[PDB]
Amino acid sequence: YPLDRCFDDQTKMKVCDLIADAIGCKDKTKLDELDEWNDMDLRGTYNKHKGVLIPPRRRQLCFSRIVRGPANLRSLNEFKEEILKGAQSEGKFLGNYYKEHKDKEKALEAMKNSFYDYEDIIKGTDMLTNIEFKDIKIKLDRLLEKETNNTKKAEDWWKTNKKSIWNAMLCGYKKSGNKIIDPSWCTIPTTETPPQFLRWIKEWGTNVCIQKQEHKEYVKSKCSNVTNLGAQASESNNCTSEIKKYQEWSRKRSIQWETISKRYKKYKRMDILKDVKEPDANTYLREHCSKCPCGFNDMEEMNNNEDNEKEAFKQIKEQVKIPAELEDVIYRIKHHEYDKGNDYICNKYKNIHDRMKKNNGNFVTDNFVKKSWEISNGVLIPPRRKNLFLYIDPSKICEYKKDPKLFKDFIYWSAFTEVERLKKAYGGARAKVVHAMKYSFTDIGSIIKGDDMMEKNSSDKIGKILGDTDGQNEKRKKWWDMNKYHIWESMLCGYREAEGDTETNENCRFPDIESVPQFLRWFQEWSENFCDRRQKLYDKLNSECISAECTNGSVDNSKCTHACVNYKNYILTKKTEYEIQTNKYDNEFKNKNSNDKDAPDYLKEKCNDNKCECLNKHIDDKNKTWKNPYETLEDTF
């Protein structure tokens, strides 16, 4: 009762106690956030804009000004503050559900949205046919203004005329008899007033994003941990269809926010800020509230496109894997890429890049493209990865690691700079650059998890950070994903610089090779860097002499003589490596995840470019090996 109790209590503030409730409020709380805000707010909605979604606006504008009489009972009107009487409390008056939901932030957000809605109405920004919205607002303002002065109507009237604003939420129900001692909760950022454009777009953003947060809540709570052995106990399959229903109504909102992209049509009244930059609505929502993303984009996948989709007939059916796909985190935009590059988030992401880190330590151009293979442990790590640009030093240590966000940004910067490094290394070669991004991304993943054979020093450094002080890398693993999406889109954005707008449809949108073991990835890339080198060799000097393998040691001309020399040295190196990777595989990566196949079969099936899957001339690379040319390399228990 008399406790600390934000100043409302300890004020001798019996004034609000003497203040009663408005004659309005025919409801204090009806059904909250759900499918009601669609178009049922106005008729002839085309006026002044297209018909749009609304907050709990028509659901709470308690109407004590029934008469709309003269400004004689309306000197300070005693209702535009009285209607708000009732607040964060035992749990009613616009937020009733939070007491059952056990979250004060729900009531606080309801208060803030309704409050700024009243600010809008006082200034006048509504697109809905409401009597108070009509002249009565400015009529009362002008009538109160009738003293041959004060033509600052909105600025002076904005609460009444005297006390700044917002004094009406305090002393709610039971004088707001349920609270939290922190004044930051007890008073909102009243001082800052987002503009009316920002207010209506934030109306939209909240009214959709908070609902989609609760939609994620339905997705996680029910329709998941079910239909997977099992529930409840009949089948619980139809729960899946329920999200299909959610999507449906949400998808309407989809096209609706497209109008929000236009909003006049005039794409924006104002520009880049904490929640708004609006190249599109999805960018706003990503830039939007702390208790965001979008969403949860823009799923389940109808559109939200260009491709990819699932998505037909509908579904296949064969059953839909949205259960398996989305029951687990993913909780956010992965769906992506699609974007494909038609965006703004990339360039502002570059605005993040080379800033907060000004290339204060940056290496490129070692020309590892034209180099050979090296053991470095007796293990033959790729020259692709040998100088992979990422390394930390003192001032980036366990004591330094109290800024995981900044460290994450540094990792993104490293990946982006790596993208430019590959650009310079190939001198620009888009097809090669895409696979460059593939192995670089997946090897950065290996490092950040920490399994690399050649890495022995910065692996310990990243072990110092991110915890995991034992041999286990659990926290590093649970970091790597989910950071996979952000790192990969970072590298894709880096790649887009030369293309501008050209989707890497040739590649898997997210590199699937992330799943497979790291050593297998190195073998795959060295196979990819193999027998494309061979084709270049045939182009160089086998083109003129002659057509194929010569029928002796080698001679038709001195040039392709040297071509055969390079060939046999290259094959010698390949046989040594192929041997070491084969024994490594059959020993310690064979038949885990039940890969019943020899390493060359893995080479065949994982390859898709068809440059690999060699199949050499004077064949040494194939699905098998000579000396009993059947296959090998099987293991079991």
Residue numbers in the entry: 1988 to 2624
Quoted from the paper:
Parasite-infected red blood cells sequester in the placenta through interaction between parasite-expressed protein VAR2CSA and the glycosaminoglycan chondroitin sulfate A (CS) abundantly present in the intervillous space. Here, we report cryo-EM structures of the VAR2CSA ectodomain at up to 3.1 Å resolution revealing an overall V-shaped architecture and a complex domain organization. Compared to other PfEMP1s, the ~310 kDa VAR2CSA ectodomain is relatively conserved among parasites. It is composed of a short N-terminal segment and six Duffy Binding-Like (DBL) domains (DBL1-DBL6) unique to VAR2CSA. Several of the DBL domains are linked by complex inter-domain (ID1-3) regions with limited or no homology among PfEMP1s yielding a DBL1-ID1-DBL2-ID2-DBL3-DBL4-ID3-DBL5-ID4-DBL6 structure.
Likewise, the C-terminal DBL5 and DBL6 are more separated from the core, linking the protein to the membrane in a physiological setting. The DBL5 and DBL6 form a rod-like structure with weak inter-domain contacts. Flexibility of these domains is further supported by two separately generated maps based on different subsets of particles, showing the same core structure, but different conformations of DBL5/DBL6. By contrast, DBL1 and DBL5/6 were less well resolved compared to the apo structure. The simulations also suggested significant flexibility of DBL1 and DBL5/6, consistent with the relatively poor EM density in these regions.
